[model samples]
Target: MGQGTAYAEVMNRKVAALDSVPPTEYATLAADFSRIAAVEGSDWMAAYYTAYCRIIPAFGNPSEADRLCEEAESMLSKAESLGGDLSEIACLRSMAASARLLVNPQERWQTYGAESSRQLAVALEANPANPRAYFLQAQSLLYTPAQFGGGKDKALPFAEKSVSCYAAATVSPAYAPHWGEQQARQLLMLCKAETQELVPR
Candidate 1:
């Protein structure tokens, strides 16, 4: 297959497989993506999914996840330097930062938090309609402690905006970023309930 056609076939298959791929297969899937990334070099999508596959093992081996997350960061950097899509790169940045944070949120937050904020800023500026960016930012806020300027009140709008963005977004199925809309909606529901509970009703 031609490069474009090959990428479409591979990525589309990945999009479908991820929904059913169990954690036991994550390492294998990651290696597969890693091979693709090595061959493609500038395929940020491959790197993004490789990082995602690595993330599946965080609970079992955080150190490994950190290494893989950094690896993904490098690939994303490579893709960006090669003039890949900054909007998608920004989204990957958020994902990478989130992956690192997932390894140890308390410890990694200080290191990766600003990077996530920076990436999300770029993602929004480059593609204001991308729901994943808004959802990622809302996730950051949702998980952050209220003392740290994070609260449901602050997160609610971003989560709600994510839903709106998802509604208006037109992503290609071949390279879809459709994973976050439902999560955003779930967060919205949780936030609304929390906000309501806080009220004297």
Candidate 2:
């Protein structure tokens, strides 16, 4: 995990250090996720990590994004076939919904906005007690414009949901809660920061 965070640190610095360019770290991680994800694990874990690998490449290369999105979706569907906790399914669907957006034309962004909301509903239904599911759902909601039943103004609620999810997810037995918590915190902070509304808005 430290190596992964180290990877992030190097990546963040490289953004400023080198000629400003595409996602070097994201590409590297997308490559490396091959190994970590190859080892035997739960179906949910495979879907989660494999989807991550697919989506990361999109940061640097959009052409590959659609194929990767399909791969991630395939993995997720297979995981669903295997049947685990509904929570995992919800999260994977939530992630997959976002990944699908990469393959769409600009005109379709608004179309996909509704899928985000759909995934959010599924995620929330999967787990009412866990904050992560709710948080992810909230995130999905924030992606839409008011015409699609969302608003930029609603971002904070989703961000808070993420914070709550991260808080609960951190206490899991797998000790995976901290990273998720940190990610949620960072996302929450970004959503709150007025400057961040530039691209995301």
Candidate 3:
């Protein structure tokens, strides 16, 4: 394979492996992405995946959540500097912000929550068809209380949009993100289930 092709293959392999492992092993998988980023130097996908892997683990490891998210944010900044899809980068930034908020949601919601919302807005504006942006929006609302203008009912429309967007999304350039579809589908199902329960059976 050519040098560029080989690099892309390596990045794809790392992403595949990252997907196969459970969250408990994400820290190790992230190191592979980090090494790829170090070698590629200018590959935005490598940096982006490094950030993504860290952000996933942060959700389950609250004690290290802020630190992991901070690292993810730094890697995202590097990815942004290297220039890839701005919409995708913004989506990852929103994920990182949400991970930080997960650490102490009651105390940190106003700050990180707003940051997440703002980043999602930027992502959608950059690419209105970006499913991950809608997926994240649905997730945020699904977890929020109804009095705060968020609930399964309010989240349903965004989840529906995300699933539809994912159905129509293309996977090109060999390094573009192709995740969150399954998550979006699952969230959509949950929203439907909650809506069903509200009906008088």
Candidate 4:
């Protein structure tokens, strides 16, 4: 492999190894990988992982997530300009949209909610097998209140869908997303537990 290609492979392996570490550590490590990838001229992979790194913080800090998401937007567009599998690109859009939804107040879901769906549409339309897209959709549903057609119940199927997708999925050796199976499994367990809890004795 060329230097850029070698870096991309190493980056993928590094990301695959990150689930064992604390969430606090991902951004720094991923940032380092992003910088290396950029220097090596792997711009799209750099941006992809940079946004991926930003997501951990975004879970709690929606405002920063939104900022990072916008930053990733230009990078994603750059990636698109470079041309290749856009599945992960659309998946990142879905992720960014999800982050935006997290920060949107209840009253604003009218727009953010729809936009989130639209982003997922782009993702699934590009690649129905994009596990992260399914995972994130399940994520959006899991946190949403049942009154709005979201809940573990509503999310269960999506979670299960991702589970199935992940089983058969494999990441590209050239730096594609391949890290969400654990999240999908964890969410599935949570949904099952919560679903059981809601059952009447």
Clashing pairs in 4: none
TM-score of 4: 0.75
Residue pair clashes in candidate 1: none
Clashes of 1: 0
Q: Give per-model TM-scores.
A: 0.79, 0.63, 0.86, 0.75
How many clashes in each candidate?
A: 0, 3, 0, 0
lDDT tens digits by residue: candidate 3, 116-153:
88898898898888888888889888777677798888
Question: Lowest summed-lDDT stretch of 10 residues in model 2?
Answer: 171-180
Give candidate 1's error at residue 125 in angstroms: 2.5
Q: Pick the candidate with the highest TM-score.
A: 3
| Sliding window of 10 residues with minimal summed lDDT for model 4 | 1-10
Taking every candidate in turn, the Cα RMSD to the unseen true structure, in Å, is 4.1, 8.3, 3.3, 4.3
lDDT of 2 by residue, 135-195 (tens): 5655555555577566545667766876765555444333122224556666666666676
lDDT (0-100) at residue 117 of candidate 3? Answer: 83
Candidate lDDT (C-alpha), each: 0.73, 0.55, 0.82, 0.71
Please report the candidate that would top lDDT against the real structure.
Answer: 3
Error of 3 at 19 (Å): 1.0
Ranking by lDDT: 3, 1, 4, 2
Question: RMSD in angstroms, candidate 3?
Answer: 3.3
